[PDB]
């Protein structure tokens, strides 16, 4: 089997990426985050706190007929922003792009933080990390791609972000028409549970390229590329005015300026973000200062190559018995 879907930025800045899924029987089709570096599909339901919902589509497990409590399950997750979720577990059917799962653990939200509240974009995130991350207790859940992976044509999905424009999901087949030249390939270390891998270097726009080696995680839920503070300064200080502002958190910059792209290795290969991808616009309404899209990794103790990264890349995540990683340019 295979199955494909579109994904479509939530908003004008490419913040996350929403991706229609079907659950139940009828179809309840909601608009998850699917997320890389989390386990946890959660929804948005009937039984979320009234107040925390506002404009998310939910999932009402009653409604669907192949909906089955997981007695006694329950799940509480936070994330690297500080958001958090929990709630208790329904198995039903889950589909993606035509892929069918059965018996797939629904996280069903009780309680959701202000951020999600906030986006009513979001109805939920499907998690695609290792299902050793998995919240649910007393009984840890696999994944949907863990679950469908045994029926897949190949033990793989891919994430094609586009930028400012919808891209692919797609599971179990890599589409030869969707990248340029040839996918590198790089090992993956799942001993954090994360796709966790190690980039050979960086370059400043025209500058020359850095060997040296970058340990971090392709996280498709993260908005933007966190890297270390040495990395990011050097990227930062081609551009005039550039600073990090503690106030705001994070470097910002004139937005009278034009940006440099910022290449990262693949083994001897190199994906070139372009600079327009780096610019997240004006820190509040009307602002001439800009926020950055790379951002210093130091104060979370991991380096996170998010989609402003992956969005210059087509991305292979390889589950099969060793795991990798691949990325072609597009």
Same mark, same amino acid.
């Not at 009653?62 to 994330?79: E, N, R, V």
């Not at 589909?95 to 018996?103: A, E, M, N």
């Not at 891209?167 to 549970?193: C, L, M």
């Given at each position: 089997?295979?199955?494909?879907?579109?994904?479509?930025?939530?908003?004008?800045? !490419?913040?996350?990426?929403?991706?229609?899924?079907?659950?139940?029987?009828?179809?309840?089709?909601?608009?998850?985050?699917?997320?890389?570096?989390?386990?946890?599909?959660?929804?948005?339901?009937?039984?979320?706190? #009234?107040?925390?919902?506002?404009? $998310?589509?939910?999932?009402?497990?009653? %409604?669907?007929?192949?909906?089955?409590?997981?007695?006694? #399950?329950?799940?509480?997750?936070?994330?690297?922003?500080?958001?958090?979720?929990?709630?208790?577990?329904?198995?039903?059917?889950?589909?993606?792009?035509?892929?069918?799962?059965?018996? $797939?653990?629904?996280?069903?939200?009780?309680?959701?933080? &202000?951020?999600? *509240?906030?986006?009513?974009?979001?109805?939920?995130?499907?998690?695609?990390?290792?299902?050793?991350?998995?919240?649910?207790? +007393?009984?840890?859940?696999?994944?949907?791609? !863990?679950?469908? %992976? #045994?029926?897949?044509?190949? +033990? /793989?999905?891919?994430?094609?972000?586009?930028?400012?424009?919808?891209? *692919?999901?797609?599971?179990?087949?890599? !589409?030869?028409?969707?990248?340029?030249?040839?996918?590198?390939?790089?090992?993956?270390?799942?001993?954090?549970?994360?796709?966790?891998?190690?980039?050979?270097?960086?370059?400043?726009?025209?500058?020359?390229?850095? &060997?040296?080696?970058?340990?971090?995680?392709?996280?498709?839920?993260?908005?933007?590329?966190?890297? +270390?503070?040495?990395?990011?300064?050097?990227?930062?200080?081609?551009?005039?005015?550039? %600073?990090?502002?503690?106030?705001?958190?994070?470097?910002?910059?004139?937005?009278?300026?034009?940006?440099?792209?910022?290449?990262?290795?693949?083994?001897?290969?190199?994906?070139?973000? +372009?600079?327009?991808?780096?610019?997240?616009?004006?820190?509040?309404?009307?602002?001439?200062?800009?926020?950055?899209?790379?951002?210093?990794?130091?104060?979370?103790?991991?380096?996170?190559?998010?989609? /402003? #990264?992956?969005?210059?890349?087509?991305?292979?995540?390889?589950?099969?018995? *060793?795991?990798?990683?691949?990325?072609?340019? %597009?």
């Amino acid at each position: 089997s295979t199955g494909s879907a579109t994904t479509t930025p939530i908003d004008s800045l !490419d913040d996350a990426y929403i991706t229609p899924v079907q659950i139940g029987t009828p179809a309840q089709t909601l608009n998850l985050d699917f997320d890389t570096g989390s386990s946890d599909l959660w929804v948005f339901s009937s039984e979320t706190t #009234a107040s925390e919902v506002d404009g $998310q589509t939910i999932y009402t497990p009653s %409604k669907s007929t192949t909906a089955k409590l997981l007695s006694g #399950a329950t799940w509480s997750i936070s994330y690297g922003d500080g958001s958090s979720s929990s709630g208790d577990v329904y198995t039903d059917t889950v589909s993606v792009g035509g892929l069918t799962v059965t018996g $797939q653990a629904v996280e069903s939200a009780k309680k959701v933080s &202000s951020s999600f *509240t906030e986006d009513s974009t979001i109805d939920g995130l499907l998690g695609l990390a290792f299902s050793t991350l998995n919240t649910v207790s +007393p009984t840890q859940q696999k994944t949907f791609f !863990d679950n469908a %992976k #045994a029926s897949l044509d190949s +033990p /793989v999905f891919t994430a094609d972000l586009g930028y400012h424009a919808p891209g *692919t999901y797609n599971f179990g087949f890599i !589409d030869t028409t969707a990248y340029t030249g040839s996918i590198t390939y790089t090992a993956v270390s799942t001993k954090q549970g994360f796709w966790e891998w190690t980039s050979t270097g960086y370059a400043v726009g025209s500058g020359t390229f850095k &060997s040296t080696s970058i340990d971090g995680i392709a996280d498709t839920g993260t908005t933007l590329l966190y890297l +270390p503070a040495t990395v990011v300064s050097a990227y930062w200080a081609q551009v005039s005015g550039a %600073k990090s502002s503690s106030s705001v958190g994070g470097y910002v910059f004139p937005c009278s300026a034009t940006l440099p792209s910022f290449t990262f290795g693949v083994g001897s290969a190199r994906i070139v973000i +372009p600079g327009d991808y780096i610019d997240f616009g004006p820190i509040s309404t009307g602002s001439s200062s800009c926020f950055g899209g790379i951002q210093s990794s130091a104060g979370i103790g991991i380096n996170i190559f998010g989609d /402003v #990264a992956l969005k210059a890349a087509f991305v292979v995540f390889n589950g099969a018995t *060793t795991p990798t990683l691949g990325f072609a340019s %597009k």
